[PDB]
Amino acid sequence: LGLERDVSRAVELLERLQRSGELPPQKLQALQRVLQSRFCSAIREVYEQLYDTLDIT
Amino acid sequence: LGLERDVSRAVELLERLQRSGELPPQKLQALQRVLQSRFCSAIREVYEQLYDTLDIT
Amino acid sequence: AVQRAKEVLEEISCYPENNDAKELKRILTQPHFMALLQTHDVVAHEVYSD
Amino acid sequence: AVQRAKEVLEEISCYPENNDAKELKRILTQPHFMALLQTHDVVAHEVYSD
């Protein structure tokens, strides 16, 4: 689902820009916590888990 | 959250009616498979895991 | 998943004799169980719709 | 979660100098990442939003 690749890429991309400090990083750091948060982790596991679930049943 | 108690109760409640066999057991069997299915299990784990996440974050 | 549950409520609703149908209509209608079901459709749809 | 993400796209979108912003906008725009985020709001909303 390219979720780990897209999220992880969005997380580092937000940090990347955060390091640059060209635009308001406050919103970028907010996202970091929105995706990095343990919550989105469980949810993310769902997407990957669900796909597998499809292959099982 | 009460999803385990409500789902598990809906599962046995669907079986319960199935035991009696008075109403269309087809749609009821469908539900049982929708709540018992491994998929809904992952999703269910999310609701529980999510609540915990709240307590963490 | 929510629609299927809903449909069941209608069937079991028409049955005022099955006590299981009663407790099932209540729980099945409980928004909470609906929320989880919502997740069921969101994913199940994006994976088996288009 | 989605709104916050979208908000960032707008900010980074206003900057045609950051190459990460471009690739970041794309990733944050695809409905896939939005779907997961959708789950974020669905639960959080049904958790304690009201």
UniProtKB/Swiss-Prot annotation, chains A, B:
Assembly and interaction partners: Forms a complex with CASK and CASKIN1. Component of the brain-specific heterotrimeric complex (LIN-10-LIN-2-LIN-7 complex) composed of at least APBA1, CASK, and LIN7, which associates with the motor protein KIF17 to transport vesicles along microtubules. Forms a heterotrimeric complex composed of MMP5, LIN7B and PATJ; the N-terminal L27 domain of PALS1 interacts with the L27 domain of PATJ and the C-terminal L27 domain of PALS1 interacts with the L27 domain of LIN7B. Forms a heterotrimeric complex with DLG1 and CASK via their L27 domains.
Family designation: Belongs to the lin-7 family.
Residues in L27 domain copies: 3-57
Domain of life: Eukaryota
Role summary: Plays a role in establishing and maintaining the asymmetric distribution of channels and receptors at the plasma membrane of polarized cells. Forms membrane-associated multiprotein complexes that may regulate delivery and recycling of proteins to the correct membrane domains. The tripartite complex composed of LIN7 (LIN7A, LIN7B or LIN7C), CASK and APBA1 associates with the motor protein KIF17 to transport vesicles containing N-methyl-D-aspartate (NMDA) receptor subunit NR2B along microtubules.
Positions spanned in the full protein: 8 to 64 of 207
UniProt remark on domains: The kinase interacting site is required for proper delivery of ERBB2 to the basolateral membrane. The PDZ domain regulates endocytosis and recycling of the receptor at the membrane.
Official protein name in the record: Protein lin-7 homolog B
Location of this chain's protein in the cell: Cell membrane; Basolateral cell membrane; Cell junction; Postsynaptic density membrane
Expression sites (tissue/organ): Expressed in the kidney; predominantly in the vasa recta.
Curated annotation (Swiss-Prot), chains C, D:
Protein name as it appears in the record: Peripheral plasma membrane protein CASK
Family to which the UniProt record says this protein belongs: In the N-terminal section; belongs to the protein kinase superfamily. CAMK Ser/Thr protein kinase family. CaMK subfamily. Belongs to the MAGUK family.
Domain notes: The first L27 domain binds DLG1 and the second L27 domain probably binds LIN7. The protein kinase domain mediates the interaction with FCHSD2.
Assembly information from the UniProt record: CASK and LIN7 form a tripartite complex with CASKIN1. Component of the brain-specific heterotrimeric complex (LIN-10-LIN-2-LIN-7 complex) composed of at least APBA1, CASK, and LIN7, which associates with the motor protein KIF17 to transport vesicles along microtubules. Forms a heterotrimeric complex with DLG1 and LIN7B via their L27 domains. Identified in a complex with ACTN4, IQGAP1, MAGI2, NPHS1, SPTAN1 and SPTBN1. Part of a complex containing CASK, TBR1 and TSPYL2. Interacts with WHRN. Interacts (via the PDZ, SH3 and guanylate kinase-like domains) with NRXN1 (via C-terminus).
Compartments it resides in: Nucleus; Cytoplasm; Cell membrane
Protein function: Multidomain scaffolding Mg(2+)-independent protein kinase that catalyzes the phosphotransfer from ATP to proteins such as NRXN1, and plays a role in synaptic transmembrane protein anchoring and ion channel trafficking. Contributes to neural development and regulation of gene expression via interaction with the transcription factor TBR1. Binds to cell-surface proteins, including amyloid precursor protein, neurexins, and syndecans. May mediate a link between the extracellular matrix and the actin cytoskeleton via its interaction with syndecan and with the actin/spectrin-binding protein 4.1.
All copies of domain L27, residue ranges: 1-50
Gene: Cask
